[PDB]
Amino acid sequence: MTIVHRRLALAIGDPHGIGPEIALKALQQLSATERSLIKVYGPWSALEQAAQICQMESLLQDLIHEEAGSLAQPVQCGEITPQAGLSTVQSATAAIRACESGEVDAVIACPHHETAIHRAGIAFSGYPSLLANVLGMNEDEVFLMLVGAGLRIVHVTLHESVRSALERLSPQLVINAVDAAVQTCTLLGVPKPQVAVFGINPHASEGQLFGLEDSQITVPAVETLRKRGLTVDGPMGADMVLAQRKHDLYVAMLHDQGHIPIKLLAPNGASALSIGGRVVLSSVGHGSAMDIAGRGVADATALLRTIALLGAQP
């Protein structure tokens, strides 16, 4: 039962958290063929540490690895340290640049601890932002696509107030997001997807009865996309379209429009993809779990589910 059909970069996240642990446990479960498609980015010391704990010493030899985020002192399982914050970022930075340059086709990032990163002096508002910085893009040109229960919902805005989101929406922004998410769909194994665009306002404005935004923003975006030769329905009322369940990719205007479906239908088995240039970075949708770090009791299910998704055949 083979889940990895392409080259992937795995960055092991906070070297003090469960990242290293779950990395190894997840490579354990693969055939050797599959393991050699996964390049691991992170400090060797932490993978040593997690191996002695998990009793997986055999698997270090049979592992493709690039040193990133090296440590100047021994690993301290469970401690929040400025150093470990830097490791995380360097490791993730490394894997992204191997995707950017084409050594791999996507990145998976193991958990971070935000305190550790802040304490290192690094601005971090998530993987959308980090991914932008590293690539030299604007933060509004990288987007978040959630994937769970077969719904793929890309978000035009994310993690700002509604108002701020509203005063940023534009025909161009929607277009960029759909383009990013369609190139991503090809990676996920839906090369030619049928897209549905959510309305900004309820019922997609209902012409212009419930506001003018849709007529100014979504409708002109949809026309452009169709002309470029994409199959694209809408704008339609978010509630209505999601119920039909007849699309491969939904496009949401506001955070909640996309996050409510996903976390309702797949509250732990969802994946969060950051999409920018040709880089698709997914998180493993759990924290660094410092409380259990180094006790070898951390589950890799989420990491395997994430690999299965970005490692997909079509």
Q: Which is nearer to its own copies, 74 or 150 (CB)?
A: 150
Smallest gap from residue 125 Cβ to its own copies (A): 9
Q: Is 151 helix (H, G, I), strand (E, B) or coil?
A: strand
The mark string for 227-246 relative to its own copies (x by CB under 8 A, - otherwise) is ----------xxxx-xx---
Q: Which is nearer to Mg ion, 14 or 213 (CB)?
A: 213
d(CA 23, CA 17): 11
Q: For 294, phi and psi rounded to 5 degrees?
A: 95, 10
- Name which of 74, 90, 8, 81 is nearest 42 in CA terms: 90
Query: Which pairing describes strands 271-276 and 279-283: parallel, antiparallel, or unpaired?
Result: antiparallel
155 binds, among its own copies, Mg ion, Na ion, none (CB under 5 to 8 A by kind): none
Please state the separation of Cα 208 from the chain's center in Å: 35
Beta strands, E only, the chain = 8-11, 38-42, 64-67, 106-109, 143-148, 151-155, 195-198, 232-236, 249-252, 271-276, 279-283
Could you say whether residue 162 binds its own copies (CB under 8 A)?
A: yes
Tell the residue number behind the tokens 């990133």, with chain if given: 68
Structure tokens at 188: 């996920």
Applying CB under 5 A, the span of 78-86, 133-141, 213-221, 291-299 interacting with Mg ion comes to 213-221
Among 173, 177, 232, 309, binds Na ion (CB under 5 A): 173
Could you say whether residue 224 binds Na ion (CB under 5 A)?
A: no
Q: How many residues does the chain have?
A: 314
Give the CA dihedral 5, 276, 113, 263, nearest 10 degrees.
-80
Smallest gap from residue 279 Cβ to its own copies (A): 24
Could you say whether residue 209 binds Mg ion (CB under 5 A)?
A: no
Structure tokens at 30: 């693969």
Smallest gap from residue 216 Cβ to its own copies (A): 12
Q: Is 250 helix (H, G, I), strand (E, B) or coil?
A: strand
Could you say whether residue 26 binds its own copies (CB under 8 A)?
A: no
Q: Which is nearer to Na ion, 59 or 273 (CB)?
A: 273
- Name which of 135, 39, 174 is nearest 95 in CA terms: 39
Size of the site for its own copies (CB under 8 A): 35
d(CA 241, CA 248): 12
Applying CB under 8 A, the span of 22-30, 197-205, 226-234, 295-303 interacting with its own copies comes to 197-205
Structure tokens at 84: 């470990």
Tell the residue number behind the tokens 């940023």, with chain if given: 168
The annotation status of 239 as a binding-site residue, yes or no, is yes
* Residues between 114 and 133 that touch Na ion (CB under 5 A): 126-127
Applying CB under 8 A, the span of 48-56, 74-82, 204-212, 293-301 interacting with its own copies comes to 204-212
173 binds, among Mg ion, its own copies, Na ion, none (CB under 5 to 8 A by kind): Na ion
Applying CB under 5 A, the span of 49-57, 208-216, 218-226, 294-302 interacting with Mg ion comes to 208-216
The annotation status of 255 as a binding-site residue, yes or no, is yes
Report the interface residues with its own copies, using CB under 8 A.
158-164, 166, 200-203, 205, 210-213, 237-240, 242-243, 254-257, 259-265, 267
Annotated binding site: 112, 114, 127, 159, 203, 239, 255-256, 259, 263, 287, 289, 299
